[PDB]
Design a protein around this ligand. Structure first.
Ligand SMILES: NC(=O)c1ccc[n+]([C@@H]2O[C@H](COP(=O)([O-])OP(=O)(O)OC[C@H]3O[C@@H](n4cnc5c(N)ncnc54)[C@H](O)[C@@H]3O)[C@@H](O)[C@H]2O)c1
Ligand SMILES: NC(=O)c1ccc[n+]([C@@H]2O[C@H](COP(=O)([O-])OP(=O)(O)OC[C@H]3O[C@@H](n4cnc5c(N)ncnc54)[C@H](O)[C@@H]3O)[C@@H](O)[C@H]2O)c1
Ligand SMILES: NC(=O)c1ccc[n+]([C@@H]2O[C@H](COP(=O)([O-])OP(=O)(O)OC[C@H]3O[C@@H](n4cnc5c(N)ncnc54)[C@H](O)[C@@H]3O)[C@@H](O)[C@H]2O)c1
Ligand SMILES: NC(=O)c1ccc[n+]([C@@H]2O[C@H](COP(=O)([O-])OP(=O)(O)OC[C@H]3O[C@@H](n4cnc5c(N)ncnc54)[C@H](O)[C@@H]3O)[C@@H](O)[C@H]2O)c1
Ligand SMILES: Nc1ncnc2[nH]cnc12
Ligand SMILES: Nc1ncnc2[nH]cnc12
Ligand SMILES: [K+]
Ligand SMILES: [K+]
Ligand SMILES: [K+]
Ligand SMILES: [K+]
Lengths: 461, 460, 464, 462
């Protein structure tokens, strides 16, 4: 009689369970932690509020946390990213989860609140796992008394880490955090190669458009922009890259991309005259990857080639000025998470109008909105780090420290390099790769231990 | 002017033509000339320089001179000098001692010719080094000269490692800037430079088709990453070896099979430990580690007949060439290309099929069998070198009181803002256009519109 | 639209509005096909044509169907594969008043029944006079079961490699009854559809079926013809380590030069049928096998027994017998993951352990995986193939082979390709759809290389 | 000993050439397989072959295979810049008449061909021709018709030479049958495409040492050479645009991930400067011609090119670029052999620091052979195995000895049968260590082939 959940359709549970069993075989680092730590129960007594895309991969993460002793209450961090069979399988396992694909904004907020509250009162939470910072923000704004008893936050993604560091700067952050994003087996695995796999995946599922031979503009060339650019170039697109960071732009050039700006001489002064109309009128596909605001703005949207595809793979939908499009242009749903936006006006459209744009996932994270996000074998690395981060902060017991000791420990930190390497080793073994062992003479020659770590903390890979 | 030694001074006109072309390929370096020529920030500097005497190094040398410095120059490798570059620098009245094909003894003599002027120590006050050999000679043999020198600027990963070992041991005598770990150096030079120049050198040395053949790249740091791409883009089937599991993970994700020369990765010294089946299929082995003996005697014995063996790390001990000198007969095909006959030591059959082809006698193959990195890539590294020389020279460490020197003795990198400024000049050289953040956008992501755009922890 | 229309059978007519939305998008992706619509609509070159059509009932086929109709034809349609229909495409065609009998997930019995529903109208042979086929199944049924209908048919236009081979066999055996156009061997079909189509849709289908990471894993592609070339690229561009098998040494040479290792599932390439001839060390390392040959049993029972645990097995050739799925049905337990995705448990036939690790993943039950687990080739690629189909239909229909005297018929009973000039005109429209700009030869240049300024630009021997 | 019937740059380079020939033999298994297969049979005994093709190390292995099979030869190069002087020396030192050096003048080029045609001032008793580009074939038809009476055939290497043969056949002026070696798949789709993939960026790097990644290239043409050339540049990270007159080839460029553009506005070349897309050409760092056509990089294109762009040709003849215009109007500064800065500031003199120049490679001649070493041995293995088989077939047919009625039936331009194409391919695949699968009898029956091949109909395009 378990009822402490809300999912789209509980009858999808058997299907979700079949896919979880497959996913376990694709996630050796995460399942290795399950086997290594099961007897010890290092998360016994942990009570984790989790907010991250309710995918099959998150399902394996949740059940690893539970297998190590934790109790959890879970929600998704995006209205379109849940896989309903994954949510059903978790709910059918007796785990509180409030998540479905296609939530409204009000439902999204309600779902987070259902994890925070149990039977109408604050849950006895003591750990937080977040992706993007929404749950973290609600706790700080609305439930400060709950944070007094929370030992830490483990944050998944670049945007969430920025929000933690802003709180730390302002002296408003109430509990320490681990920046999971900046493990190399997260940032340079998930952010880059994950988007390489799943960006062209989502575009094909949403539009079935041929990509070879067409023109793309990727806004940004950080980890996500690098992987996105490769996702499209490997399909044969002619990819141009925009950047504000001259070092990242230099990498784009050296990687064989043309670096362009939507604005003449790169000056974004807000005028239509500043738009490089010739450039934008050639673009078949624009992808935003920045974690910034309004990097595909109204004047760019007005100048884009007819029938171009517009999508966002950064964490939040405000990378694209969709608000402008809702206010001025008529939306025609093609199918879920695929809309034609008719630039002919707001009040109705011609069904055969040629002047439209195709927007994917209403500008929300397109890989998760129009496909299934990153594949299991990539999320293996991110979620192995999440588990280790939860163990570390839970064992530190920040909430139980004296005030003076809390002040010495209130920080945003990364996991040590040795853990990062041990996660990587399990990933490599999953490919059947064979890592060479240094001889004593060789380890002495380059000044490392035979077991590692093999690089200084300054190394960038 | 007679204060130099080069292979042929009459090549000067040719080198000058190539320097004029190279200048048009090095916008960051030439931008430093234009912007600091008035200030003359290096007026009074006397720089000892030891780096591959290429055309690219000539543009660096003349940039330092254009900003006020005097220099005395040598190459940091016996095979890396471009004889027309050295001639052009000598013909410009700049002391330089470098030619392609030096002996080990001639290599040491050349460094000593920069250190000494008229049989006496030159009054040097700055050091520019690539690999640490000049730094090592100064500390061991001429330690008193180091009392006048304001700083060292080291170019490459191996040399930085040596600098840090000296700092840890309390034997570093002057402050130094790690030029290697600017992003516009490391992640431009070390990776992209080897992508351009590794397949270049293999083609010039052998003219072998690479497509469809099997390569083993030992290492997957920046040089191994660029080397692997240089071969894969030609259509090689590339396997990668690594001791670092993170770098190995990147190799897998980049589409490479990760293998070890040793069964289960365990290098226990025996022939039995060699994966003879793997090595018997490899047509090309490339070492990229900066480590010792990563292509060892037992691997060389197991290699497929007629395989190519080469090294693009800094030092020639990555391959056990000493074993091959002891046991096998060397047949020179042409300069820097040797057939190594595994049939025996004394003599060989001209038609023997059981040989390996060794490039550049195991020395840096890109500089040994071709011309190293291209000008537009070296532009990034060398603009950092100029900035680092200005920075250390203006701090005047050698003139500080004893107490102030103790706090000033360190190995530092350049600030990120300068790194970004070099990158911007490189991007403009491609005709790239960088976008400027709006004030609201800069506030949104927590940066200045000017930059730096990333925290110092960012890995790119 | 027509009142009381019931002459169809589809999965779900309510998908029609969704199908129509996608047809309108596809029209913008198919400029060669839509150019033929605009150029020929007024002439009505197919007025009076009654076309039996048998090809994958996708959105792309929908645009083809409505082009033929816009040029004057009546059609009756079925799919040429049990898994390749897009149900919203079939619904939109049926909702337009066009007889169509197709849905995703037909049984073999239903598949045959659907073709017969096109052949029959109101219980009697339709007065068909044209045939459009993909793989030869409809061609075969007409010759075998309804030979008298072939007396009124002017031509067959066959789409794919396997179907052309069947036509050539019939021609050499004297059993072909009507002339045909080999649409496959236009360059804008073969070297666009067969190669680039599979490049787009093979990794698409594997991702939709399994969501497996492909980068860093080991693939074996059996075959390196046009489909094998495109399939190998689909996987290599994702970062797979791809090995290629071939029986044709020229195709094997191309695979080597393209950067692939060429290997055989059998030691020294010799299949003596025994398990001892299997290269078990090779097969035990393969994460994904893809068959591309158009041949029989190229992924056989002994290979399936030797494959690495949890490897994915799929077929992108026309027929499922490339893989010995019959052996797997006889001996191993099938666990459906989701539609067109099965785990095949090598532990035995009767039961399976839900947590057994010794299984293979079979996609689309061995049927064309790009159409079975995704949506096949994209519209802009199918534009080339289907423009050729329209031109071929117009040519044969205007030829009126069925109305000729017996003597004249023997003279024209042939399998032909379209002339190179038309191939070039299709290609030009495709290039314009990318915004490409073709240069025009000067008179002096055209004289220098011996061509007309308007083309054709290559001799018929040219291979591109 | 006593051998003087040659002319090379420096005979003392022979030992060096020989060392490279021994290496190249291990890279050329199909050609060396033909040596072992036919050495005892001596199928070329009595053949006397006039040869005109790039005197490279790879051509050295071809020559010695023909000699090992019984033939005598007299050789020249088919390009003034393509000879490797150590290869020519090794051949001369083996007692084989060769007349070739890198850096010939036009007068020396013609003299070298004439030295092969004449021996002791009189027509050699030639009975076979091996040609690359058709220059030797043209001289024989125009100047030595009596020699063609006794010649059994021509085996022609390259696309341009084949077109010239077909023109002669059309006009009824071809005097002896030919084999089109170019259109074996192990030639055209190996040499023309993959060879240029290897050797184009090679020659550009040796000539300029320019970084290619991140820069803009324009490839004129997308046939076999243009496809290989575009890949040579793209795989280095260039942003490559492609021009074409053939819409099918342009379709392939699009689908291959290239932007297809024209140097002319709307692709209409009307001869005016107004027709030039100045904005497009002003952004191009490197232009490569691949067409076999005339004037596809014309004067107005050269005037509009971005300052300091590299200009080169990898088609067979230098007239793909209007170099004559540049010699008439602009000052040439030699950087080093086969690399010239062309100063667009005027014809008389230049400023050493002028920024407005172009870099021309190999004076517009075949850039891969002029600035590097052409295609690698393991690729040329395929082309030259086909050459040996073509020589054997036409020499054994003995066209010159046939009655007039029988000659009329055999006067044609043909390709080798596909079975032989496949046999060359298999030796190439074995050289990579590849393992071809053998069809079962049922599989061969199912697809309608013999187990041993041929595996494809003659219409198949690969
Ligand atoms: N969808 C996914 O699966 C996924 C995965 C990881 C991260 N993300 C999200 O994607 C975003 C980017 O993450 P990241 O790790 O790549 O961060 P990052 O800091 O490495 O890269 C962002 C880049 O955008 C550039 N940029 C910022 N404003 C710009 C502008 N106006 N124009 C052009 N370039 C601009 C920055 O210079 C920077 O290089 C974040 O919101 C992150 O949370 C999404
Ligand atoms: N030739 C050039 O132009 C050039 C340019 C830059 C640097 N270098 C030199 O190349 C070398 C590598 O430089 P880098 O920047 O790549 O350093 P790096 O630290 O980034 O890479 C070296 C890699 O080798 C790996 N490695 C070490 N021992 C190994 C072993 N036994 N087997 C397999 N892998 C092993 C390490 O794990 C590491 O990832 C240094 O000597 C550097 O000075 C050469
Ligand atoms: N799914 C699709 O979208 C699609 C598209 C076009 C064609 N096809 C089908 O794909 C198949 C292949 O078409 P194609 O145009 O590439 O034909 P093709 O003749 O060009 O190539 C088939 C290749 O398979 C090779 N082969 C045959 N038997 C083999 C064996 N035992 N082992 C290894 N290789 C073997 C042949 O040598 C040949 O090169 C046909 O059935 C065709 O109808 C499918
Ligand atoms: N350098 C080498 O090693 C090498 C090797 C093989 C062939 N070649 C030579 O290269 C040339 C091309 O050979 P191929 O086999 O690629 O021939 P091809 O017929 O396959 O290709 C030439 C292409 O040029 C295109 N073209 C013609 N005029 C054009 C124009 N004005 N603008 C743009 N494109 C135009 C044609 O449409 C055609 O596709 C010939 O001269 C051939 O002999 C050189
Ligand atoms: N599959 C996935 N599951 C959870 N978080 C993700 N972020 C990106 N892809 C994801
Ligand atoms: N989308 C598609 N429609 C019809 N036939 C196809 N063959 C391959 N892909 C196809
Ligand atoms: K997924
Ligand atoms: K260089
Ligand atoms: K489709
Ligand atoms: K060569």
């Amino acid at each position: 009689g378990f009822t402490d959940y809300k999912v789209a359709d509980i009858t999808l549970a058997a299907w979700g369970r079949r896919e979880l069993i497959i996913a376990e075989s694709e996630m050796p680092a995460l399942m290795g932690l399950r086997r290594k730590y099961a007897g010890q129960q290092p998360l016994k007594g942990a009570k984790i509020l989790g907010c991250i895309h309710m995918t099959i991969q998150t399902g394996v993460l949740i059940e690893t946390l539970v297998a190590l002793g934790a109790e959890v209450r879970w929600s998704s961090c995006n209205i379109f990213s849940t896989q309903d069979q994954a949510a059903a399988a978790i709910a059918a396992a007796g785990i509180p989860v409030f998540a479905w694909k296609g939530e409204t904004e009000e439902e999204y907020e309600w779902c987070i609140e259902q994890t925070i509250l149990k039977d109408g009162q604050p849950w006895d939470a003591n750990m937080v796992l977040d992706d993007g910072g929404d749950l973290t923000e609600i706790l700080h704004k609305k439930y400060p008394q709950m944070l007094e008893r929370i030992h830490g936050i483990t944050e998944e993604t670049t945007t969430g880490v920025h929000r933690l560091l802003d709180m730390l700067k302002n002296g408003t952050l109430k509990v320490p955090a681990i920046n999971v994003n900046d493990s190399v087996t997260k940032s340079k695995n998930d952010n880059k190669y994950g988007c390489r796999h799943s960006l062209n995946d989502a575009i094909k599922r949403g539009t079935d458009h041929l990509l070879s031979g067409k023109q793309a503009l990727v806004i940004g060339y950080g980890d996500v922009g690098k992987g996105s650019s490769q996702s499209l170039r490997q399909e044969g697109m002619i990819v141009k890259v925009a950047e504000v960071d001259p070092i990242c732009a230099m990498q784009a050039c050296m990687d064989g991309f043309e670096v362009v700006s939507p604005y003449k001489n790169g000056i974004n002064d807000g005028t239509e005259a500043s738009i490089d109309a010739a450039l934008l009128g050639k673009i078949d596909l624009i992808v935003t990857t920045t974690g910034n605001v309004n990097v595909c703005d109204a004047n760019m949207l007005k100048a884009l080639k007819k029938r171009a595809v517009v999508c966002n793979i950064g964490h939040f939908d405000n990378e694209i000025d969709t608000a402008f499009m809702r206010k001025n242009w008529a939306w025609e749903e093609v199918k879920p998470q695929v809309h034609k936006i008719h630039r002919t006006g707001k009040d109705g459209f011609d069904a055969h109008n040629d002047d439209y744009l195709i927007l994917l996932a209403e500008g929300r994270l397109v890989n998760l909105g129009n496909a299934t996000g990153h594949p299991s074998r990539i999320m293996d690395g991110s979620f192995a780090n999440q588990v280790l981060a939860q163990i570390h902060l839970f064992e530190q017991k920040y909430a139980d420290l004296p005030a003076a000791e809390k002040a010495k420990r209130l920080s945003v930190e990364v996991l040590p390099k040795k853990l990062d390497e041990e996660v990587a080793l399990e990933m490599v073994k999953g490919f059947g790769g064979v890592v060479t062992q240094l001889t004593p003479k060789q380890a002495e020659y380059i000044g490392v231990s035979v077991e590692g770590p093999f690089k200084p903390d300054t190394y960038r890979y």
